[PDB]
Amino acid sequence: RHVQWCTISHLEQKKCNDLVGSCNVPDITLACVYRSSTENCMAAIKDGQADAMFLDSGDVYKASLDHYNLKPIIAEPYSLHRELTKCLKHRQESLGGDKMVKGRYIPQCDEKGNYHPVQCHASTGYCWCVNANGEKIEGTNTTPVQTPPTCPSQVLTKCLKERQEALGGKIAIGRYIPQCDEQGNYRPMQCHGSTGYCWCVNAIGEKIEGTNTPPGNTQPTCQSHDWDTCHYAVAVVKNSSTFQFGQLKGKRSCHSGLSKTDGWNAPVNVFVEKKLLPWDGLAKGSIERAVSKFFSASCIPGATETNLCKQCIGEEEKKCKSSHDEPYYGDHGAFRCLQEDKGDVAFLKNTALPDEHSGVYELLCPDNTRKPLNKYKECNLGKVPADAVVTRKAGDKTKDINDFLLEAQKKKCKLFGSPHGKDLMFDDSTTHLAPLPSEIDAFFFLGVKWYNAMKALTEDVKLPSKNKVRWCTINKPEMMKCKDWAAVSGGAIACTEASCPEHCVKQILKGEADAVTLDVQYMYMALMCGLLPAVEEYPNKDDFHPCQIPGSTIKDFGTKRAVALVKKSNKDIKWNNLKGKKSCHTHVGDIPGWVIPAGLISNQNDNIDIESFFGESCAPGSDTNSKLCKLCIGDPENPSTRCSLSDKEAYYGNEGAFRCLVEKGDVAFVPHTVVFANTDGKNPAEWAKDLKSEDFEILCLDGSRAPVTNYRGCNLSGLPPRAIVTREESVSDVVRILINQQSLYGRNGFEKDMFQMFSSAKGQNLLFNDETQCLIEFDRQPKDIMEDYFGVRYYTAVYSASRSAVPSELIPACTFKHCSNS
Ligand SMILES: NC(=O)OC[C@@H]1N=C(N)N2C[C@@H](OS(=O)(=O)O)C(O)(O)[C@@]23NC(N)=N[C@@H]13
């Protein structure tokens, strides 16, 4: 296996070549491929000439576009603010669950708020081992009859671990040994035990620039509890000059480079906001030209304007290249340009500032003051996104790149410094590189605010009208019905196309669409990504009053209620003893007949297979050999149609599960409507025949029973309605436009002869479900949106009332946190 790294300079190629020799990762060989600039490397990776390079966030954005089609895959983790530990969050979530779901696992946290390595489930007496994230180590469960397992100790904190490594297992004399606090985080002030120097670090141990102090001098105050580890764009100046930020016009400037976010996007955004630059849209020429009029002479590697390359010092064709062969390229090159007095101000980020407190440099704040180097958090041009290793979108080398860097970091190879110079291959300030979420792209990595801000400098971005709802459609018939809606809507409705509901959620997140109707099984993912219900489908045929007068009180929303249905004859069966019994399920994947029962059973029995929990059962979709297909009859006109997802199975579906109950089962998992639909001689067939409703009851979660009529107070869970989701800031617009459309084209629409929202000749259930009575505004309560939309019962039964389930690999990408401003 091979990884070919693209380098942009002779200096970087030298360092990459040293790593080929010095860094021995078994099974993966590194090789180095030289190109003369950042853009030529981007093209080499797109073309397969190389596999990976490290890019500034501004180039991550440029590389994501169709010319190159690259994506970020590895980056340094960062933190925005201190958070609850994972164990304490899990305890709070599970204590907030539905108390009628009895016997749930509540985690056990220790005096630092971490998981005890041994976790136990009170109601079942089972114990198991966990990792630092509280996830079960599979195959360590022990039953109550045995003593609790022996579980390895928890991994030490960053500080205690680096203290252990520094000590090397026998004092490390003459070397820095980190000093940790009681919680095992880094003390704010650190001192070198041999040189006498002291400096400040944040809570995860990163040095604060501008704080390094030789012995005998006064130390700057170190801030405690600093968990803001985003990097900051800053403007650095010498204390021998005296201009302020608003007098930059006509000065000389050094920039890390034309495409870098700290050397271009951040300062330029501020120039534009302050109107120091006469420029707003692409009608006034390019940004680069306007900047060319502002400064008298600059070094901005990668620029074309002549005065913006005037102060660079690269020899011959190397001059002004996005490459270390231009000595003023990058953060440290821009600082060198100030230091050598080719510029009056350098634009870079806090991680390239001097570590020493004392000296001739300080920061130029945009509020027209100057502040010391260590005050960049209050004197800056914005937080900037993380930088990242990128590769082709297809990801054919992602695993090899990840494996190599994880192994090289484990072995402590010299990835992050070099004799040959600074910031070669990676930023010298980097300490660890970790894999990003597998579905991350530039949009989710940079975040919507920085992504749009960098788009804004390249094109005028016409913002879509808040008076138009772009509806996302998932198949061609839906598209065609939405084109008919658009034609009658007077421009209120437009249409977009995607292949599946998850891709619609992506389009709405990225501003390509505005709304989509989602089944229940997608709402957890939509709500985690930050969309909100705007309106919901009301399905109750018996009461039209909430549809007639909007806003009025809904007596019964009318969704299905999952129940456990048993015969009045069998009077021993209660909820708490279904184990081993024979059960009938509509089919695997059905929410009321499977997801809700499987959910409650795993919550109360340590995630035991619902296949193993019951005795013999019928649940179409299971494997024909398993005990879940034994009751499954098949087709009476024998063909093999057994345990199949069709009507060719006698026991399939809502009626079929009810069949299996009366014929040969103790319990059936079904919506509450099925019993009334097949009793009181409502079904003609011979098995139904008579079968009085009062011959059955439903099981309550508290061990009691009730007649099949009290499903509102004695069910497993009610389902929430389907919802129309949108972005939070668009909810009020979408509600207004849809309610208006509904007064025209709903079931009592004033213009319902011109168009019907809730039916179509083109297909069934297009855009909305065909039995929808109307759409009702979602009344947002002051509570967690999970609990608000699902209801506490469903949230607990299906998701353990947790925000940590991952039913879709999009969730880790769309919840990735960003380094944005306000
Ligand atoms: N009447 C009725 O059912 O309205 C449904 C409507 N939409 C939902 N998805 N919900 C879930 C229900 O949760 S539940 O536990 O009460 O079922 C709810 O009623 O709270 C509700 N939450 C809010 N804010 N409005 C409600």
- Six token digits for residue 685: 């067939």
Find all residues with CB under 8 Å of 123, minimum gap 6, and list them: 102, 103, 104, 604
Count structural domains, the chain: 4
Encoded amino acid at 25, one letter: V
Answer whether 454's CB lies under 8 Å from 431's CB.
no
Name the DSSP letter for residue 490.
T
Answer whether 499's CB lies under 8 Å from 516's CB.
no
Ligand 1 atom nearest to 554, measured from its CA: 1
- Six token digits for residue 607: 């995630």
CA 792 to centroid of ligand 1, rounded, Å: 10
CA 778 to centroid of ligand 1, rounded, Å: 8
Nearest by Cα to 520 from 721, 356, 318: 721
- By most ligand atoms within 8 Å of CB, the mutation choice from 536, 722, 789, 795 for ligand 1 is 789
Q: Give φ, ψ of 284 to 5 degrees.
A: -90, 35
Q: Is the domain of 724 the same as that of 706?
A: no
DSSP string covering 320-350: T-SSTTSTT-HHHHHHHHHHTTS-SEEEEEG
Ligand 1 atom nearest to 556, measured from its CA: 1
Ligand 1 atom nearest to 779, measured from its CA: 24
The last residue of one of the domains, among 384, 409, 440, is 384
For ligand 1, atom 15, name the residue with the nearest CA.
791
For ligand 1, atom 22, name the residue with the nearest CA.
788
Q: Is residue 64 part of a domain?
A: yes
Q: Which residue stretches of 519-609 are H helix?
A: 520-528, 545-548, 596-604
Q: Give φ, ψ of 174 to 5 degrees.
A: 80, 10
Nearest by Cα to 631 from 677, 665, 601: 665
For ligand 1, atom 19, name the residue with the nearest CA.
791
Quote the CA–CA distance of 206 and 386 in Å, as a whole number. Answer: 15
CA 791 to centroid of ligand 1, rounded, Å: 6
- Six token digits for residue 195: 């040189």
Ligand 1 atom nearest to 788, measured from its CA: 22
Quote the CA–CA distance of 254 and 264 in Å, as a whole number. Answer: 10
Count of residues making up the chain: 822
Quote the CA–CA distance of 662 and 216 in Å, as a whole number. Answer: 89
Q: Is residue 40 part of a domain?
A: yes
CA angle (243, 248, 250) in 5-degree steps: 110
- By most ligand atoms within 8 Å of CB, the mutation choice from 725, 778, 781, 784 for ligand 1 is 778
Q: Is the domain of 424 the same as that of 368?
A: no
With b meaning 16 or more CB within 10 Å and e meaning fewer, what string describes 523-560? bbbbbbbebbbbbbbbbbeeeeebbeeeeeeeeebbbb
CA 797 to centroid of ligand 1, rounded, Å: 16
Ligand 1 atom nearest to 781, measured from its CA: 24
Ligand 1 atom nearest to 718, measured from its CA: 17
Q: Is the domain of 574 the same as that of 694?
A: yes
Q: Is residue 161 part of a domain?
A: no
CA 817 to centroid of ligand 1, rounded, Å: 30
Specify the resolution in Å.
2.0
**Which residue do the tokens 């120039």 mark?**
271
- Six token digits for residue 527: 């709500």
Residue 21: CB atoms within 10 Å? 8
For ligand 1, atom 25, name the residue with the nearest CA.
779
CA 750 to centroid of ligand 1, rounded, Å: 29
CA 788 to centroid of ligand 1, rounded, Å: 7
Reduced to 3 states, what is the DSSP secondary structure of residue 401?
A: helix
Quote the CA–CA distance of 205 and 199 in Å, as a whole number. Answer: 11
Quote the CA–CA distance of 784 and 795 in Å, as a whole number. Answer: 11
CA 818 to centroid of ligand 1, rounded, Å: 32
Q: Which residue stretches of 250-377 are H helix?
A: 266-273, 287-294, 330-339
Nearest by Cα to 585 from 601, 564, 608: 564
Ligand 1 atom nearest to 792, measured from its CA: 15
- By most ligand atoms within 8 Å of CB, the mutation choice from 101, 540, 788, 792 for ligand 1 is 788
Ligand 1 atom nearest to 789, measured from its CA: 9
CA 557 to centroid of ligand 1, rounded, Å: 8
Encoded amino acid at 727, one letter: R
The set of protein residues with a Cβ atom below 6 angstroms from ligand 1 is 536, 554, 557, 718, 720-721, 778-779, 781, 788-789, 791-793
Q: Is the domain of 413 the same as that of 375?
A: no
Ramachandran region of residue 807, left (φ > 0), alpha (ψ -120 to 50) or beta? alpha
Q: Is residue 463 part of a domain?
A: no
Name the DSSP letter for residue 202.
-
Ligand 1 atom nearest to 780, measured from its CA: 24
For ligand 1, atom 13, name the residue with the nearest CA.
791
Q: Is the domain of 626 the same as that of 686?
A: yes
Q: Is the domain of 484 the same as that of 551?
A: yes
For ligand 1, atom 2, name the residue with the nearest CA.
557
Ligand 1 atom nearest to 793, measured from its CA: 15
Encoded amino acid at 492, one letter: A
For ligand 1, atom 1, name the residue with the nearest CA.
557
Q: Is the domain of 587 the same as that of 701?
A: yes
Q: Is the domain of 288 the same as that of 347?
A: yes
**Which residue do the tokens 């084109």 mark?**
483
For ligand 1, atom 9, name the residue with the nearest CA.
789
Quote the CA–CA distance of 245 and 259 in Å, as a whole number. Answer: 22
Q: Is the domain of 315 the same as that of 377?
A: yes
Strands 189-191 vs 493-497: parallel, antiparallel or unpaired = unpaired
* Distances, alpha carbon 214 to alpha carbons 218, 339, 359, 657, in Å: 9, 22, 13, 79
Q: Is residue 642 part of a domain?
A: yes
CA 517 to centroid of ligand 1, rounded, Å: 17
CA 285 to centroid of ligand 1, rounded, Å: 53
The last residue of one of the domains, among 456, 477, 496, is 456
- Tell me the residue range of the domain where 302 lies: 233-384
CA 800 to centroid of ligand 1, rounded, Å: 18
For ligand 1, atom 16, name the residue with the nearest CA.
791
Q: What is the dihedral of CA 325, 329, 335, 338, to 10 degrees?
A: 90
Name the DSSP letter for residue 487.
H
CA 789 to centroid of ligand 1, rounded, Å: 6
Q: Is residue 32 part of a domain?
A: yes
Reduced to 3 states, what is the DSSP secondary structure of residue 748?
A: coil
CATH label of the domain that carries residue 29: 3.40.190.10
Reduced to 3 states, what is the DSSP secondary structure of residue 713?
A: coil
Ligand 1 atom nearest to 559, measured from its CA: 3
CA 553 to centroid of ligand 1, rounded, Å: 12
* Distances, alpha carbon 641 to alpha carbons 289, 618, 649, 655, 704, in Å: 72, 13, 6, 17, 37
Q: Is residue 144 part of a domain?
A: no
Answer whether 656's CB lies under 8 Å from 650's CB.
yes
- By most ligand atoms within 8 Å of CB, the mutation choice from 518, 535, 557 for ligand 1 is 557
Answer whether 2's CB lies under 8 Å from 400's CB.
yes
Quote the CA–CA distance of 430 and 423 in Å, as a whole number. Answer: 9
**Which residue do the tokens 């970091």 mark?**
409
In what order do the strands lie in the sheet containing 723-726?
516-518, 723-726, 532-538, 774-777
CA 724 to centroid of ligand 1, rounded, Å: 14
For ligand 1, atom 5, name the residue with the nearest CA.
557
Quote the CA–CA distance of 770 and 722 in Å, as a whole number. Answer: 12
**Burial (Cβ within 10 Å: 0-12, 13-18, ≥19) of residue 516:** buried
Q: Is the domain of 377 the same as that of 390?
A: no
Q: Is the domain of 250 the same as that of 330?
A: yes
Q: Which residue stretches of 641-775 are H helix?
A: 653-664, 673-678, 731-745
Encoded amino acid at 580, one letter: G
CA 481 to centroid of ligand 1, rounded, Å: 29
CA 781 to centroid of ligand 1, rounded, Å: 10
Strands 388-392 vs 53-55: parallel, antiparallel or unpaired = antiparallel
Ligand 1 atom nearest to 790, measured from its CA: 11
**Which residue do the tokens 């520094």 mark?**
166
For ligand 1, atom 4, name the residue with the nearest CA.
557
CA 727 to centroid of ligand 1, rounded, Å: 20
Find all residues with CB under 8 Å of 121, minimum gap 6, and list them: 105, 127, 606
CA 558 to centroid of ligand 1, rounded, Å: 11
Helix (H) or strand (E) holding 407: helix 398-410
Q: Which residue stretches of 9-115 are H helix?
A: 10-22, 38-47, 57-63, 86-95
Q: Is residue 12 part of a domain?
A: yes
CA angle (623, 628, 630) in 5-degree steps: 95
Q: Return the axis-axis angle of helices 266-273 and 287-294, rounded to nearest 10°.
A: 80
Quote the CA–CA distance of 627 and 621 in Å, as a whole number. Answer: 12
* Distances, alpha carbon 814 to alpha carbons 64, 444, 505, 510, 522, in Å: 17, 6, 10, 11, 14
CA 551 to centroid of ligand 1, rounded, Å: 14
Q: Is the domain of 410 the same as that of 343?
A: no
The last residue of one of the domains, among 671, 688, 715, is 715
For ligand 1, atom 17, name the residue with the nearest CA.
791
